């Protein structure tokens, strides 16, 4: 029953991994195929200790632990991208951490990530992650109020919105929080009465 | 092999095995036709059964609408009947239209009444309204809950954003498990 | 084996017995057909299943609703009788939309009438709302409270926060365990 | 070999199907006639078919339209009860124009409405219009939904561009490929 | 050899068809008589004809026009059920004649209503008109639009050019191509 | 009847531990979880003492005891994780216990814990526990007012809440507590007509 | 008919001593389980004197005995926890015993607890047990007002009050007499009209 | 089950491609012929990795890997046209990479499409691209107010618009996304009332 062959007809919608602890994973790139692998687990068989595997659900679990074990480390968010060599964007103005500490926190990771060969940490300027945010969203043509603040910026939208305003306005936010993701820019949609 | 529940219909009998498996039970719906159907479990989990049947206010109502209280079938009619029957109709529609929005698994819509206002010589009240709504678990809740507020705010002849409050959540880890039989 | 209640119904058999369980008291429903269910239990346990009865008023009462004393049946109406029918759908249709909030197991509605303002030349009064709520243990009912609160507050034509009440709490230890047979 | 619904309509009965493969369980139609559609599932599945009957309110209810509580059938009518059925019409009438436009796939329209402003000797209020819409995936949303709003703004006796509000998105990946068999 | 559509009438029929076949799958359409037309699918392709039934809302509604809710078969009537009922013929009227225009496939019309300016002791409103047109591939639709405005313009009592709104397009690629069989 | 089988389809769910005092241990991550495993152990049958593991309801066990035997004792709370070295936050500040005195509290902690091989004790700052708290709140764009007082400090949140900022509160807040825990920070909301 | 198969499936609910009065004592920690063990006593049957142990039930008794033969004696509250040693608080402050009239006065103690080896009797400051019980509150964001009296304290809540502070109170109040006890330190919630 | 075959009768509306990846590529020009391939894929069969291409899509994918990994990277748009060679437009005046380093680029994006042969980076000129966008907009004799901003420029189009005016600037619009897409120049429609 291999499991290739367990997985719906398009293959190419899961990556099979792996893991150096004997569990064979599946990379899923969206809770609907998500659930599709997990169904299948459920229903099926393969005797093998197996296990899917979900971007966000992955960089929350990691995120736990790590606040844990580091606390008050200063990061943005995990890119898996290419399994085997995620890359851990980590802010370069707030951390101080040494080449040798930085090695320490790429290898817990890695025991972190059964599947992962390697980590690759690379530090982020903070400056250009707020300069993104702000000018994309001035750029769609949107009222805001910026909140800078030691720690992180808000970007705060009030008053009455157009519908076609509001539109543009999430997109934009999603999309930011997809690739930086929300731990240091905070969007604020809120749609009120003038 | 207990007998738990007798004269069930088929929404009630679905809800009622859904939740005892979700809390590690197996259950059996038995179909005796026009007596309905019948729920039995293992002896073993009976007593934990019946535990979750009294929790849980076990077999469910049914849905209470307004309409079901001021019927068609009567032979005269009131200004107060009639209009509560409109807002009954409504509500309704509104909740079939949020429950087509993208993500939405499920939604519930309110809105206030007004039974008496021109009855004492006074103008009709701000309308207000309340629902609530479950997401796709992963769903970005924070941002979603300004379109159903949008929405329904030029939804209704006089409405406003500080009289229409939207509670709102996602679903729970899926029960794709089978509880499993006793050990003997 | 000895006799304690006999010509239940479905709802009432299984409450009696879900209290007898609690208590460490093996108990057996009869089904005999159209003339409802029995329960009997061990004559050891006897003399206790009897005191229990007592003390916790069963069998149980049907449960009371307002539209239930002023039904559609009646060949006329009155401004009176309609209004508190429609009182009565809402607070049912209230307590079916907050059992489908997240973690809530159960919850009951309240809500003040009005039956002679405009009677008597007067304006009507200020809506008063109360509720009760279980939650699935575990649960952070001190934050939990305040989107009932919300919920209800745009619900309906005229409260505040000073007028609605809240009092909740969370379900007890799960009994997933037999009572037992006596020693003999 | 499990039953999970019986009696369902043709349209329920493909809905709750079409919920079921998107989720990866297959199943069975079945046709009896008279009685209605049946639908079963592999035993391997059951217990997720059941957890997601649940979670998609399945099967689906009739669609609530206004026109339904006001029928012609009467052999009296009112003001109140002819407007409200004119409305119900024209709501359905606008649904059936949008959902001919480019790249629309799925539409639905509200209109607010008037029960009581001549009643009280008032003059009318503004038309409040709202519509939801799901087009092509790839589509340039937003611009699209200057067309629905130019369209509805002369559909009517007195709307305006603030008293519109359209919401909008696109179809999700389509299920091209069955959800496979149970592994025995 | 699976059924997905039973009872249809022969509109609706063609309908789903062209709608599956544009998509890539044969369908089969079969005559039971007075039983209706039954549409069935090959096994490969059922997963995908299901998902778009529920896409494209289908089988279609019958078209909604407004007098078919204020009917001449009442034994009474009143200014407003006539009133209404004159301008539905009329929207039907403009509409056949828009399709007889150079370069035209289909089109659609609307006009505002009035149903209690006079009721109210008030002058009636401007009359809004909107239309929607398809045109074939190729066509100058950026001139064409001002016939159809204009059209309209003399068309009714009082409208203006600032009161009236067409939106319009064309036709999409001829699917002049068959699906083909499974490959088996 | 290995404990194993006895527990559901996706075993990945509970974490089996092996103690000391020759209970078999179950470490569930949820109470779903807790009462899956709990209504194992009362239908099925397993000839071996077991017990259940729930993260809340041990660190409430413990802090009972705590309290009775080293009262006025500053602490945070025990993250688990890893069953076997179970973390103790303890306030850096508020405590002056000595090296060999917190030597003897881990002991007594490991008594507590039969799966436990180890109690790795550690002082956390209580500045930065509070500068967490106030920082990821005004973050959210949220109304609030501080209250300093000795041995905690309350954040006060009233007048009336819009939808969005009350849904952004509770996010916020019970992240916090899952952290913290709520011993030294104290949130306060109160939603209230203006 | 080993009592510990008579007792239910999940043994560990209960702890089964041997007094050295021949009666075989049953501990329980909540008044359901205490029922259940009488239940079983009743139903069942045990050739051996036999006798259900409630940690309140307990307090109570020997606070009974207690206050007859030693009469204005100071203190706070019986620790039963681990049955063998139970942990007698005693007011440092208010007490002025001897050692050895505290010896005699433990002897006693053991004399009321057939199955408790030994008694550890303690003295507690009373100005930490105030110092506790105000703060607390206050923590809470309650209103009240203190009143301090010869021989203890009592915190007066009065006003009308919003359904978050009542739980947040009440949940506070019961904590505070679990531990300490009602006999120093008492609350006083009264919910009136403004 | 030769695939040319078992596309539509008009077998020129897609361009069968060989991917060095042994994966058999089916270019669609529009998502109705992009279903169509899907559907044939799914229904029909053939014993060999295949995956059908879209343009947008396509885009798309490669924005986002992208993003990730050249973050700020100042571009326009890939034109697929002749798959074998797509056109990489790239901001002249906005980066500063060095010849080599436009060398490694392009050979990154060669990984990420397996039937690309090769890929023309080529460099544009931002002027040029908000000059057309203006230059067409006021041809169509259309109001609008132009946003200059740092990394790019929006053009507004408020007020109440005449429907014949509404067709004309949806047009315009869309050929310009077409070709140099949305990544410099925005557009805001927005139908308001005067």
Do not use: C
Not at chain 1, 12 to 30: I, S, T
């Amino acid at each position: 029953a291999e499991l290739d062959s367990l997985l719906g007809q398009e293959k190419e919608r899961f990556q099979v991994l792996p893991g150096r602890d004997k569990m064979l994973y599946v990379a899923a790139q969206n809770e609907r195929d998500t659930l599709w692998a997990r169904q299948v687990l459920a229903r099926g068989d393969y005797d093998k200790n197996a296990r899917v595997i979900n971007e966000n659900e992955e960089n929350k679990r990691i995120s736990i632990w790590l606040d844990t074990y580091y606390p008050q480390l200063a990061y943005y968010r995990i890119h898996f991208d290419e399994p085997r060599k995620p890359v851990f964007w980590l802010s370069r103005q707030r951390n101080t951490m040494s080449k040798k500490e930085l090695e320490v926190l790429s290898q817990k990771l890695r025991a972190l990530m059964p599947y992962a060969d390697s980590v690759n940490i690379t530090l982020m300027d903070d400056v250009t992650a707020a300069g993104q945010a702000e000018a994309g969203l001035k750029q769609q043509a949107l009222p805001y109020s910026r909140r800078n603040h030691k720690g992180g910026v808000t970007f705060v939208i009030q008053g009455a919105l157009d519908d076609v305003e509001i539109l543009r306005a999430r997109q934009f936010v999603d999309s930011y929080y997809r690739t930086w993701g929300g731990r240091y820019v905070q969007f604020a949609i809120e749609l009120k009465d003038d | 092999d207990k007998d738990l529940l007798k004269g069930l219909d088929q929404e009630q009998a679905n809800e009622v095995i859904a939740v005892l498996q979700m809390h590690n039970i197996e259950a059996n719906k038995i179909d005796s036709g026009k007596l309905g159907y019948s729920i039995t479990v293992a002896e073993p989990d009976f007593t934990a059964a019946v535990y979750w049947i009294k929790t849980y206010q076990l077999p469910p109502r049914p849905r209470v609408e307004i309409a079901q209280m001021f019927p068609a079938d009567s032979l005269v009619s009131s200004p107060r009947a009639e209009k509560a029957r409109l807002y009954s109709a409504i509500e309704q529609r509104l909740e079939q239209s949020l429950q087509t929005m993208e993500g939405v698994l499920s939604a519930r819509v309110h809105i206030s009444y007004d039974i008496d206002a021109g009855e004492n010589g006074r103008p009709p009240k701000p309308v207000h309204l309340s629902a609530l709504a479950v997401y796709e678990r992963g769903s970005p809740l924070a941002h979603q809950i300004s379109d159903i507020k949008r929405f329904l705010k030029n939804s209704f002849a006089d409405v406003d954003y500080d009289n229409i409050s939207v509670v709102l959540s996602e679903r729970s880890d899926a029960q794709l498990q089978a509880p499993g039989t006793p050990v003997k």
